[PDB]
Amino acid sequence: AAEKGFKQAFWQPLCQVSEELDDQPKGALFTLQAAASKIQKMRDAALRASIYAEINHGTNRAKAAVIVANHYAMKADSGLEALKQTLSSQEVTATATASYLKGRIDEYLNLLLQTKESGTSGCMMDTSGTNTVTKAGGTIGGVPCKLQLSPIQPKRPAATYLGKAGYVGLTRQADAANNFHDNDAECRLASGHNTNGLGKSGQLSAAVTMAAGYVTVANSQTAVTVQALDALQEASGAAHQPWIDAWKAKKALTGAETAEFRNETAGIAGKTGVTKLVEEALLQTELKKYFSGHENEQWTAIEKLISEQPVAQNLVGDQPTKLGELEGNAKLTTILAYYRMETAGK
């Protein structure tokens, strides 16, 4: 009935959203670290190729390794530029809009949770409208709903309750009076009228929106209305703008999956840096001299020779010595510097 406390069908979808927004900072941290990890892997492959060219200086495969090294160095460089120019902004913006929306939702839910008069009458009711619900650990009436920002550790990004089209569980409600409102639980937050709602001497001046514009609370003895947020489009200045902002920011996320962080499958001439390096330093013809071909199969063969190349065993722990079994930028950089010292002495 209008003006009565809210059964679980109303607030559980909000808990689900709040819980998923909690994971957006975790996914931002994951994505920033994943992008850094991919850069480091590119740099490692550049370092292995440069080491191979130092060890085998003066051979056609060494000159092939210089081309490989330059390629992966440029991949590492472009990943860092994309981290600076694009990913940083995307992940900060998703973290901020999601956390801000979660704060707006959680303040509303926390208010509902506390606004009660007994075990059977209050603003936050169970599925049948029988009892008011209580918070125990991170659950409310058995529903995961911490109403707090969890400690932030990296976690893979997931879009379940908030996805490409909007908030999947926040659909249009045709009969709020029976599906959201209980029959008898008293809740002054359910209405702006003064008899059973927020008004004191008289009705509120206007409708009041709550939870960042999700629920509209009339100043009359009528049921609430909710926004349908499951099929969103861009908007400005909406009463529910924080919902749109978080959706837009999450939708923009590309992760560490753009071309800068991905390895290239094209033929050798089409790989980053190859053609220009062959032009400036050496000038299809020049490439078969060093890869014995110009397709990805020959590139893979050079990478295999690079990976199987052992380094001097004094350079590693008492540890494998093949370059493909070594990882870590700083470690491979210091090995390259060792071989550049040897090269200079010659």
Ligand X SMILES: *[C@@H]1O[C@H](CO)[C@@H](O[C@@H]2O[C@H](CO)[C@@H](O[C@@H]3O[C@H](CO[C@H]4O[C@H](CO)[C@@H](O)[C@H](O)[C@@H]4O)[C@@H](O)[C@H](O)[C@@H]3O)[C@H](O)[C@H]2NC(C)=O)[C@H](O)[C@H]1NC(C)=O
Ligand Y SMILES: *[C@@H]1O[C@H](CO)[C@@H](O[C@@H]2O[C@H](CO)[C@@H](O[C@@H]3O[C@H](CO)[C@@H](O)[C@H](O)[C@@H]3O)[C@H](O)[C@H]2NC(C)=O)[C@H](O)[C@H]1NC(C)=O
* Residues at the interface with Ca ion (CB under 5 A): 129, 182-184
**Which of ligand Y, ligand X, a copy of itself, none interacts with 137 (beta carbon under 5 to 8 A by kind)?**
none
By DSSP bridging, strand 4-6 and strand 143-144 are unpaired
Backbone angles phi, psi at 120, to 5 degrees: -125, 5
Nearer to ligand Y, 86 or 307 (CB): 307
Nearer to ligand X, 43 or 104 (CB): 43
Cα separation, 8 vs 130, whole angstroms: 11
- Under the criterion CB under 6 A, does residue 306 sit at the interface with ligand Y? yes
Site residues for a copy of itself, 25-64, by CB under 8 A, read 25, 28-29, 32-33, 36-37, 39-40, 43, 50, 53, 57-58, 62-63
Q: One-letter amino acid identity for 232?
A: L
Cα separation, 168 vs 230, whole angstroms: 5
The burial class, CB within 10 Å (0-12 / 13-18 / 19+), for 35 is buried
Cα separation, 87 vs 67, whole angstroms: 28
- Under the criterion CB under 6 A, does residue 303 sit at the interface with ligand Y? yes
Least distance (Å) between residue 185 CB and Ca ion: 5
Nearer to Ca ion, 131 or 258 (CB): 131
Residues 229 and 166 sit within 8 Å (Cβ to Cβ): yes
The burial class, CB within 10 Å (0-12 / 13-18 / 19+), for 84 is exposed
Which position has the token pair 């901020």? Answer: 96
Work out which of 1, 2, 9, 88 binds a copy of itself, going by CB under 8 A. Answer: 88
**Which of Ca ion, a copy of itself, ligand Y, none interacts with 182 (beta carbon under 5 to 8 A by kind)?**
Ca ion
- Under the criterion CB under 6 A, does residue 325 sit at the interface with ligand Y? yes
Least distance (Å) between residue 59 CB and ligand Y: 17
Work out which of 9, 152, 177, 305 binds a copy of itself, going by CB under 8 A. Answer: 152
Output the six-digit token pair for 243.
Answer: 């919902």
Work out which of 15, 17, 69, 143 binds a copy of itself, going by CB under 8 A. Answer: 69
Residue ranges binding ligand X (CB under 6 A)? 38, 41-42, 45, 48, 263, 303, 306-307, 322, 324-325, 327
**Which of a copy of itself, ligand Y, Ca ion, none interacts with 23 (beta carbon under 5 to 8 A by kind)?**
none
Cα separation, 56 vs 311, whole angstroms: 11
**Computed over its alpha carbons, how large is the radius of gyration of the chain?**
30
Which residues make up the interface to ligand Y (CB under 6 A)?
38, 41-42, 45, 48-49, 263, 303, 306-307, 324-325
